[PDB]
């Protein structure tokens, strides 16, 4: 019911990625319904998705569709790789790094979707912090403050080539193991 109710919209927007859209629709539906991974014995609200594949604009509008459907809000545009535009490089935030931006956005918006572009090109520190947040359920900012993840939808755009383990570099294997789901976008 939930699966299709968001699946037909995802198909409407990204119809060239029907199989991947169906897979992530199922995963998001069971995660929100509670049939997903658990942070140990206790249930967790945070959902981490890995969206591989070379289709970037399709991926972006696709997560936008999920944001507008399940939560009725716009996505938050955090990038980590060599994709910076005139919007992400915000000098208004002042003394905030990428991890600081992620932590501040999570704190201010505990109920939304988070799109992390190019996790492959992210710094080692950022990936380690993401692993720590996925393990402990709390993300640490640059100043040591701990912030609860709430149930924030987390989607990270990689570019390796359902995600096969053979196409993932060894350094990212643990992230794929710990992540709730991995989806490979078709070319």
């Amino acid at each position: 019911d939930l699966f299709k109710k968001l699946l037909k919209g995802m198909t409407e927007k990204v119809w060239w990625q029907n199989d991947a859209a169906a897979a992530v629709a199922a995963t998001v539906s069971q995660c929100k319904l509670g049939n997903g991974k658990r942070r140990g014995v206790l249930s967790k609200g945070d959902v981490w998705l890995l969206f591989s594949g070379p289709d970037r604009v399709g991926k972006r509008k696709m997560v936008s569709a999920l944001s507008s459907l399940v939560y009725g809000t716009n996505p938050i545009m955090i990038q980590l790789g060599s994709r910076q535009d005139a919007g992400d490089g915000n000098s208004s935030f002042r003394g905030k790094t990428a991890l600081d931006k992620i932590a501040e956005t999570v704190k201010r918006s505990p109920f939304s979707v988070i799109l992390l572009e190019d996790i492959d090109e992210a710094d080692m520190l950022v990936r380690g912090s993401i692993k720590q947040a996925m393990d402990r359920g709390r993300i640490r900012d640059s100043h040591g403050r701990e912030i609860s993840l709430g149930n924030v939808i987390f989607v990270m755009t990689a570019s390796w080539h359902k995600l096969s383990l053979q196409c993932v570099p060894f350094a990212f294997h643990d992230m794929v193991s710990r992540v709730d789901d991995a989806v490979a976008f078709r070319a």
Binding site: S43, R94, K96, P110, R145, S148
Partner: protein, 641 residues
């Protein structure tokens, strides 16, 4: 006859009655017999010294029952380090120096500190752990709190209101040993530094493990938007598992924040303003299950509506109830014709705290005043409909008993309106809080007023305070001023000074709290044409030297972006001018050059930089504070003759 001719029993009884530490130190220098009496009858000691010279600890204080080790310099420094094999000697030294300790307060920077110091006193009854730093990483949860469980133990009271940890540590430690949890009579978990409050399951487990609790305070999350939020089931489990409860204090983590922008619904960008999973029937069952309740506090950040019937049941089912604190409880007083209802039926109340009640009107205030005729302390926050007439009539009704009044964040009640409303009890009120709001539209001796608390927005002046009505206060001794706001958008003030010289109108003023720590600005780099926090510190601290202050707690304004609360040059220079200062506590950071300014004060004795905020600086490379600087400053201060 004189004291030396009197029997020593009456002399000891007299000496035990001296509570001021300065007077006790003075009396210990009178004669040999007085020295022995004072050393034998001293009960509470707050240790003052450095970690380096801990082995120079005096052994005279053999009869102290309450020991406070949380203020050992450097503040927050690890008392015991596992990297040092001789750190185990500190435990033996403390055990030998204070063998009769029953209440202990210690800064638990490291689990080794707990494991070494706490088990030294088997007869320990009350324990308070303090930690404003990051939680050390452990393999499991609650490992550091498991070190409290001793084979020989009667810890009765546990206080974690200032001990930062994960909310899953407490249930894990309490479930490890049933005897330790069953022996607990008091449990304080009202920590505002928690990232989020306790889950429903964590609350259930904590209450299940401790069936003999008499006082219970906890920071819980009641937002239904989260998963596992505390709700009706958690409160029912609290009532069922702990029938002996006398104090129940449940509050949202945001409700405990110092900044009003965190819990005020009007100051949040649409946050809150939604019903919580708490019903009138659930509150009825909870209150029915707690016959021995004396103090109740439910400070939620989510609205609970039509709570009147529950408060009516409170009077019948809780005869011993004396204090009620309600947060975002609506319909607490909805009078019809003239019949009292809601909180107005609790005639046994002595103090009532009210926050963010939409349904409250003037008639509701009149009903509360007429029904709760025994009220001695009244506090109202965020009521948009109450006016000067209703508050004044309520104060006139409670004229015989009301001595503590707080009126904050009331739109139609400014400073002038609040002072006019408190006219009937002007000659009897002892503690008073008002908001320094001068923009509200629409015989005078405060004879017994001793404490005044003020809240003012950043950039506003203090001069109109005297003209507002707080003119003649012959007995005013302590004033607390809290300043909040974001100054990154304000311009340079047109008036040079905040107006601390206005406080010269009160001749008995000797203690001050200047809380500017909630001001957000620029610390060392402003973008362009902006003003750093040094200008605002100068604006606020000009004229502080003219006041005859003897104690001063100062909170430097913070820069949230770079996470620093440093002292600035004008602030240190102006604080140096206070010649009569005896104690000076700065809740921030300051490097050696500015700290050495304070040696010019001849009467200065107690100086400390206390980073009692979350998160405290982690090490010496994170801020401008160094352990060597603190040691040098302490040595120089103790060198002064």
């Amino acid at each position: 006859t004189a004291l030396n001719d009197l029997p020593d029993v009456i002399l000891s009884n007299i000496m035990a009655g001296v509570s001021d530490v300065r007077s006790r130190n003075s009396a210990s220098l009178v004669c040999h017999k007085w020295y022995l009496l004072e050393r034998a009858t001293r009960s509470a000691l707050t240790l003052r010294g450095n970690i380096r010279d801990l082995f120079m600890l005096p052994t005279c204080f053999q009869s102290t029952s309450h020991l406070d080790l949380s203020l050992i310099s450097p503040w927050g420094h690890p008392l015991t380090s596992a990297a040092d094999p001789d750190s185990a000697l500190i435990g033996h030294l403390l055990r030998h120096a204070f063998p009769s300790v029953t209440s202990l307060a210690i800064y638990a920077r490291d689990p080794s500190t707990i494991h070494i110091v706490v088990p030294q006193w088997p007869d320990l009854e009350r324990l308070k752990l303090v930690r404003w730093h990051q939680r050390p990483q452990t393999d499991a949860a609650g490992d550091e709190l498991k070190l409290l469980i001793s084979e020989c133990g009667t810890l009765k009271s546990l206080d974690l209101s200032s001990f930062y940890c994960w909310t899953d540590d407490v249930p894990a430690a309490l479930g490890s040993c049933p005897t330790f949890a069953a022996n607990l009579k008091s449990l304080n978990l009202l920590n505002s530094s928690f990232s989020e409050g306790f889950k429903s399951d964590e609350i259930k487990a904590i209450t299940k493990a401790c069936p003999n609790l008499r006082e219970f305070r906890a920071s819980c999350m009641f937002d239904p938007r989260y998963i596992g939020h505390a709700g009706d089931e958690a409160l029912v489990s609290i009532s069922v598992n702990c029938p002996k409860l006398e104090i129940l204090h449940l509050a949202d983590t945001n409700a405990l924040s110092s900044a009003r922008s965190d819990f005020d619904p009007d100051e949040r960008e649409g946050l809150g303003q939604e019903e919580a999973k708490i019903n009138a029937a659930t509150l009825i069952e909870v209150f029915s299950g707690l016959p021995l309740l004396e103090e109740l506090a439910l400070d939620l950040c989510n609205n609970v509506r039509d709570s009147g019937p529950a408060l009516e049941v409170l009077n019948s089912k809780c005869p011993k109830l004396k204090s009620v604190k309600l947060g975002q409880f609506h319909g607490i007083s909805l009078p019809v014709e003239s019949k009292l209802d809601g909180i107005a039926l609790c005639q046994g109340l002595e103090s009532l705290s009210i926050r963010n009640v939409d349904d409250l009107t003037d008639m509701g205030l009149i009903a509360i005043g007429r029904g709760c005729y025994r009220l001695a302390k009244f506090e109202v926050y965020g009521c948009k409909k109450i006016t000067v007439r209703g508050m004044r009539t309520m104060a006139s009704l409670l004229r015989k008993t009301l001595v503590d009044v707080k009126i904050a964040a009331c739109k139609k009640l400014g400073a002038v309106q609040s002072l006019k409303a408190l006219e009937p009890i002007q000659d009897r009120v002892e503690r008073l809080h008002i908001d320094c709001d001068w923009d509200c539209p629409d015989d005078k001796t405060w004879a017994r007023l001793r404490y005044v608390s003020l809240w003012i927005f950043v950039g506003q002046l203090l001069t109109p305070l005297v003209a507002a009505g707080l003119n003649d206060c012959p007995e005013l001794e302590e004033i607390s001023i809290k300043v909040e706001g974001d100054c990154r958008v304000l311009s340079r003030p047109t008036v040079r000074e905040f107006g601390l010289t206005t406080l010269l109108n009160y001749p008995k003023l000797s203690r001050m709290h200047l809380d500017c720590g909630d001001i957000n600005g620029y610390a060392h780099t402003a973008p362009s044409g902006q003003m750093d926090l040094s200008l605002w510190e100068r604006f606020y601290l000009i004229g502080v030297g003219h006041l005859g202050l003897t104690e001063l707690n100062y909170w430097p304004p913070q820069d949230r972006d770079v996470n620093q609360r440093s002292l600035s040059l004008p602030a240190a220079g102006l604080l140096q001018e206070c010649n009569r200062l005896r104690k000076l506590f700065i809740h921030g950071t300051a490097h050696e050059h500015f700290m050495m300014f304070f040696l010019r004060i001849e009467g200065l004795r107690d100086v400390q930089l206390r980073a009692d905020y979350y998160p405290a600086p982690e090490n010496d490379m994170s801020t401008e504070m160094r352990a060597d600087s603190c040691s040098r400053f302490e040595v120089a201060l103790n060198r002064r003759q």
